[PDB]
Write an enzyme that holds these catalytic residues in place. Structure first.
Site, PDB file in Angstrom:
ATOM      1  N   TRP A  68       0.788  -1.218   0.000  1.00  0.00           N
ATOM      2  CA  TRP A  68       0.000   0.000   0.000  1.00  0.00           C
ATOM      3  C   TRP A  68       0.829   1.281   0.000  1.00  0.00           C
ATOM      4  O   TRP A  68       0.268   2.366   0.079  1.00  0.00           O
ATOM      5  CB  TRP A  68      -0.967   0.025   1.192  1.00  0.00           C
ATOM      6  CG  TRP A  68      -0.412  -0.382   2.524  1.00  0.00           C
ATOM      7  CD1 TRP A  68      -0.633  -1.557   3.162  1.00  0.00           C
ATOM      8  CD2 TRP A  68       0.409   0.399   3.399  1.00  0.00           C
ATOM      9  NE1 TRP A  68       0.007  -1.570   4.370  1.00  0.00           N
ATOM     10  CE2 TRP A  68       0.663  -0.381   4.541  1.00  0.00           C
ATOM     11  CE3 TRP A  68       0.963   1.675   3.327  1.00  0.00           C
ATOM     12  CZ2 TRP A  68       1.451   0.068   5.599  1.00  0.00           C
ATOM     13  CZ3 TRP A  68       1.749   2.122   4.379  1.00  0.00           C
ATOM     14  CH2 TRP A  68       1.986   1.321   5.496  1.00  0.00           C
ATOM     15  N   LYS A  87      -2.213  -9.449  -7.186  1.00  0.00           N
ATOM     16  CA  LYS A  87      -3.085  -9.251  -6.035  1.00  0.00           C
ATOM     17  C   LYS A  87      -2.703  -8.006  -5.257  1.00  0.00           C
ATOM     18  O   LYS A  87      -1.877  -8.060  -4.362  1.00  0.00           O
ATOM     19  CB  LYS A  87      -3.060 -10.463  -5.101  1.00  0.00           C
ATOM     20  CG  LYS A  87      -4.057 -10.368  -3.973  1.00  0.00           C
ATOM     21  CD  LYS A  87      -3.868 -11.475  -2.962  1.00  0.00           C
ATOM     22  CE  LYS A  87      -4.588 -11.172  -1.669  1.00  0.00           C
ATOM     23  NZ  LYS A  87      -4.077  -9.902  -1.090  1.00  0.00           N
ATOM     24  N   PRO A  88      -3.320  -6.871  -5.588  1.00  0.00           N
ATOM     25  CA  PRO A  88      -2.991  -5.659  -4.840  1.00  0.00           C
ATOM     26  C   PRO A  88      -3.497  -5.775  -3.417  1.00  0.00           C
ATOM     27  O   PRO A  88      -4.510  -6.429  -3.216  1.00  0.00           O
ATOM     28  CB  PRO A  88      -3.733  -4.569  -5.603  1.00  0.00           C
ATOM     29  CG  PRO A  88      -4.893  -5.267  -6.179  1.00  0.00           C
ATOM     30  CD  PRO A  88      -4.445  -6.660  -6.512  1.00  0.00           C
ATOM     31  N   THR A  89      -2.813  -5.168  -2.453  1.00  0.00           N
ATOM     32  CA  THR A  89      -3.297  -5.153  -1.082  1.00  0.00           C
ATOM     33  C   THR A  89      -4.733  -4.655  -1.047  1.00  0.00           C
ATOM     34  O   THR A  89      -5.117  -3.838  -1.868  1.00  0.00           O
ATOM     35  CB  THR A  89      -2.433  -4.271  -0.189  1.00  0.00           C
ATOM     36  OG1 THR A  89      -3.119  -4.051   1.045  1.00  0.00           O
ATOM     37  CG2 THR A  89      -2.195  -2.948  -0.838  1.00  0.00           C
ATOM     38  N   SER A  90      -5.531  -5.157  -0.113  1.00  0.00           N
ATOM     39  CA  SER A  90      -6.939  -4.764  -0.039  1.00  0.00           C
ATOM     40  C   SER A  90      -7.083  -3.351   0.507  1.00  0.00           C
ATOM     41  O   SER A  90      -8.092  -2.690   0.287  1.00  0.00           O
ATOM     42  CB  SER A  90      -7.727  -5.740   0.825  1.00  0.00           C
ATOM     43  OG  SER A  90      -7.507  -7.068   0.415  1.00  0.00           O
ATOM     44  N   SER A 125       5.979  -6.756   4.066  1.00  0.00           N
ATOM     45  CA  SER A 125       6.677  -6.903   5.329  1.00  0.00           C
ATOM     46  C   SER A 125       7.546  -8.145   5.312  1.00  0.00           C
ATOM     47  O   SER A 125       7.272  -9.088   4.574  1.00  0.00           O
ATOM     48  CB  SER A 125       5.685  -6.988   6.475  1.00  0.00           C
ATOM     49  OG  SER A 125       5.069  -8.258   6.478  1.00  0.00           O
ATOM     50  N   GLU A 175      10.795  -7.631  -1.784  1.00  0.00           N
ATOM     51  CA  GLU A 175      11.283  -6.376  -1.227  1.00  0.00           C
ATOM     52  C   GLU A 175      10.577  -6.178   0.086  1.00  0.00           C
ATOM     53  O   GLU A 175       9.377  -5.979   0.111  1.00  0.00           O
ATOM     54  CB  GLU A 175      11.021  -5.187  -2.164  1.00  0.00           C
ATOM     55  CG  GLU A 175      11.501  -3.853  -1.597  1.00  0.00           C
ATOM     56  CD  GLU A 175      10.949  -2.625  -2.316  1.00  0.00           C
ATOM     57  OE1 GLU A 175      11.510  -1.528  -2.115  1.00  0.00           O
ATOM     58  OE2 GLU A 175       9.957  -2.741  -3.070  1.00  0.00           O
ATOM     59  N   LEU A 176      11.310  -6.248   1.185  1.00  0.00           N
ATOM     60  CA  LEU A 176      10.663  -6.290   2.489  1.00  0.00           C
ATOM     61  C   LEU A 176      11.086  -5.139   3.394  1.00  0.00           C
ATOM     62  O   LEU A 176      11.169  -3.991   2.963  1.00  0.00           O
ATOM     63  CB  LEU A 176      10.938  -7.642   3.151  1.00  0.00           C
ATOM     64  CG  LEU A 176      10.663  -8.813   2.201  1.00  0.00           C
ATOM     65  CD1 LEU A 176      10.972 -10.128   2.820  1.00  0.00           C
ATOM     66  CD2 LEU A 176       9.236  -8.822   1.723  1.00  0.00           C
ATOM     67  N   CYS A 213      10.104   2.009   1.370  1.00  0.00           N
ATOM     68  CA  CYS A 213      11.008   0.927   1.751  1.00  0.00           C
ATOM     69  C   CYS A 213      12.447   1.370   1.898  1.00  0.00           C
ATOM     70  O   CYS A 213      13.273   0.623   2.407  1.00  0.00           O
ATOM     71  CB  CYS A 213      10.962  -0.193   0.720  1.00  0.00           C
ATOM     72  SG  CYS A 213       9.426  -1.099   0.621  1.00  0.00           S
TER      73      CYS A 213
END
Lengths: 477, 477
Positions: free
Chosen positions: A147, A171-174, A225, A246-247, A280
């Site tokens: 997001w 799948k984009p974050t909700s 995350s 990428e976290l 990030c």
């Protein structure tokens, strides 16, 4: 009521579940999305698999032609998509326009690689033998996006995956899916064939986990995350999908004794407070040399005092809201935790107050001083407008601090000293280092983190390479 | 009574345990080895970590000089080490001489790469800015080797790893680890600094699992079973190590209507029966065209009938024993299940009986006919001298058979039709394809499998690449 874009159609989650998307600006409901679970995985992955067979057999030049069209349609609808991002995610308007443009350039940069997916002809030890290492598509890529920059993250992955000859399931974050779902329409206006680009929304531990670990999935590209990433790695044990992540990050910003202080304060200011700290690569911990501390801080704090927090559509706003309530609460917890551990709140530390901020998730820009290296704030990723400042007296000392972390994505240093800069190559354990300059990477570099910041790396030559598989031929004559 | 090579020293397991190494030829106990558990993993990884900081400081050309010395020292002791491999593993002497040689050439191929470890200077979008992508060492590599080629596989990993500036920890399988441990003494003679090369032995679920999952581990390079590999992938969730695995395989050997039948039968013969079938790229299932079936099989079965099983030290032997009693039992299980499913044992199918085969694990060369594509023996890796044969009438038919698999490493096809051969590029789901010859890869190729055959890929330019991290710089002037 948004639907999902699957196999060229718009459809409902079969579990019939829906969910609001809420704006962080004022908490209004912008729309409703599907909230699918694991029952919808097989179906979308199956259409992706099927569409990929024919998509792969197209000459790469023709795939790039289609995606360049796709890229331009996005740019055509820049104003609409940017305002939709501002509402659903809460970034400044000028920053959202940058993100939509970056969505287009990400796809365009991958299209440059079309006729350069070279395989190798290798010299055999045997006479009358050829060795051929071809490059081919993996098959089906699953993309998980975060997001912080949901739409650009889609572009960053759609581009490479599709040019290389894969199909994709995004799948984009909700939390922030709407601008991403709007690509579905743009995909059809571009003539991306049905099934090659699919966009789904749902639960992370249901739909998400089923997608990434599924036998029809060949690659997972994801931003988020560190724990979510570790879950995807475990999941990948089932299919042996290639996994690109990428976290977390805890980037040091380092101000050496011979830095240009005005330049460094400017670079540090935006590296921490861009996108409300939700990047990030953000300056998450600042180290200032004791010979320049006082002067560096009059300058830097002068800039922090001038950050106007407000409505992101308002051009006067220098910073918008936090993404949701949980992330807001987390700001308050970290600041309280720091003060309790002995930190000084130099500036900020509070939810904005004011009747303009009765709705929405608002936090003051915050600078924490008199901080020591062992405090939690210097280790845990805040991902928000909280910046701790630590004194140091020598280069070897600050290198120690810098490497004291479970993360190793970005770092920033300001100095005029070639030798310091040279030593970073072997001494500083961060994968993306900025010198005399704040963060912000380019399509052509390599976005790569060490330790628990991720696997694989993103962008450029080495990023694109990951969307390819190799096929080796030993041929005897 | 062997110890473990760690930090230039020879040490006991901390759990006090030991186990025997047993010859498959005559069940003789050859020696005892340490049988360490998880309590020895951190100590080993920590000395390897410490030793690598100093190794990376030695310029690459110099690291390669050291390792070419190591590799020659290995060739000096060729006869000793080969004979030891025949005793502990059971491969034919000539194949062992081959393996010892390959252990060297693997290391020497890596050395060819010492000064070709180039980074990239990337053009910036910014006026006065350099983007630099360096190649540096990852750090610590854990190498896990299988009992099919325990020494060659160590060279395959030691070379790349150390030339690139890493330190390595090798854990050879407890079944056949003697010859690998003997590298300990050669490493000291070669001047490999203490800690850069460490060899440990112990239990898969304890020592092995602790190593691959640890925070000090940066890469894991492993050969073995698919489940053991999946396990490694799961464990890497903890450290985000790069994972390079060569696992299961069910390689098809396809004889087309226009194949040279005598060429094909010979390729098919040694591709199944080399190393008693215990090769990751073995001919595991043979598909023969109906039109050439009777003539090919008369040729091929003439070669099977002429295979002599016996003492691997005897030059007259064509095939040695299976690695141990469980693997032997597995051959019996697999042939019994094939008969239960409706198959026909055309030759072999029994343990060897004779006074020469009382002690030892001996199975006949076995060929199964009247088998259909759904039988278990066509889908489960045997990893021993059992070969099912399936008829087919067309190219499209046999491609379906080939891809009907959870494995996708090697595959062989014999044909004069270059159009068939081209179609394999897009239609055959295998990573390593051999045309008009049998299996056997070279150091400059790319040994790479799809599906559940593994991740990453080994050998060559792309295999060597994986022993490297990148580090990106954005320098502004």
């Amino acid at each position: 009521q948004y639907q999902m874009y699957v196999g060229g159609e718009w459809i409902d989650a079969s579990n019939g579940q829906t969910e609001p998307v809420v704006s962080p600006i004022n908490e209004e409901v912008l729309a409703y999305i599907q909230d699918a679970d694991a029952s919808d995985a097989e179906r979308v992955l199956a259409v992706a698999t099927t569409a990929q067979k024919e998509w792969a057999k197209q000459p790469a030049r023709q795939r790039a032609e289609v995606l360049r069209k796709f890229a331009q349609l996005i740019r055509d609808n820049k104003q609409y998509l940017a305002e939709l991002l501002v509402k659903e995610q809460g970034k400044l308007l000028k920053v959202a326009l940058g993100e939509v443009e970056a969505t287009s350039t990400f796809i365009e940069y991958a299209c440059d690689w079309a006729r350069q997916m070279d395989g190798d002809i290798v010299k055999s030890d045997n006479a009358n033998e050829q060795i051929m290492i071809h490059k081919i598509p993996r098959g089906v890529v699953v993309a998980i996006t975060a997001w912080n920059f949901p739409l650009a993250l889609a572009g960053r992955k759609i581009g490479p995956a599709l040019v290389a000859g894969n199909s994709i399931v995004v799948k984009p974050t909700s939390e922030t899916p709407l601008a991403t779902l709007e690509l579905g329409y743009l995909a059809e206006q571009a003539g991306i064939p049905a099934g090659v680009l699919n966009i789904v929304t749902g639960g992370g531990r249901t739909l998400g986990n089923e997608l990434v670990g599924h036998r029809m999935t060949n690659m997972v590209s994801m931003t988020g995350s560190t724990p979510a990433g570790q879950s995807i790695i475990r999941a990948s044990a089932n299919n042996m999908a290639h996994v690109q992540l990428e976290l977390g990050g805890k980037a040091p910003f380092i101000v050496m004794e011979d830095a240009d202080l005005e330049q460094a304060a400017a670079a540090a200011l935006h590296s921490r407070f861009d996108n409300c700290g939700q990047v990030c690569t953000c300056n998450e911990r600042m180290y200032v040399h004791g010979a320049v501390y006082d002067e560096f801080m009059r300058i830097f704090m002068g800039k922090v005092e001038a950050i106007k927090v407000g409505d992101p559509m308002d051009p006067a706003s220098d910073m918008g809201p936090k993404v949701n309530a949980n992330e807001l609460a987390h700001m308050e917890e970290l600041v309280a935790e720091a003060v309790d551990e002995g930190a000084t709140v130099l500036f900020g530390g509070k939810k904005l107050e004011g009747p303009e901020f009765e709705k929405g998730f608002w936090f003051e820009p915050t600078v924490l001083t008199n901080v020591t290296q062992d405090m939690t704030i210097v280790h845990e990723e805040s991902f928000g407008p909280i910046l701790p400042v630590i004194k140091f007296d020598s280069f070897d000392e600050v290198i120690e601090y810098a490497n004291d972390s479970d993360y190793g994505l970005a770092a920033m240093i300001c100095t005029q000293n070639m030798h310091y800069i040279n030593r970073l190559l072997t001494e500083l354990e961060s994968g993306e280092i900025y010198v005399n300059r704040g963060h912000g990477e380019q399509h052509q570099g390599f976005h790569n983190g060490y330790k628990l910041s991720g696997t694989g790396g993103e962008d450029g030559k080495y990023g694109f390479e990951q969307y390819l598989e190799k096929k080796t031929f030993y041929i005897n004559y």
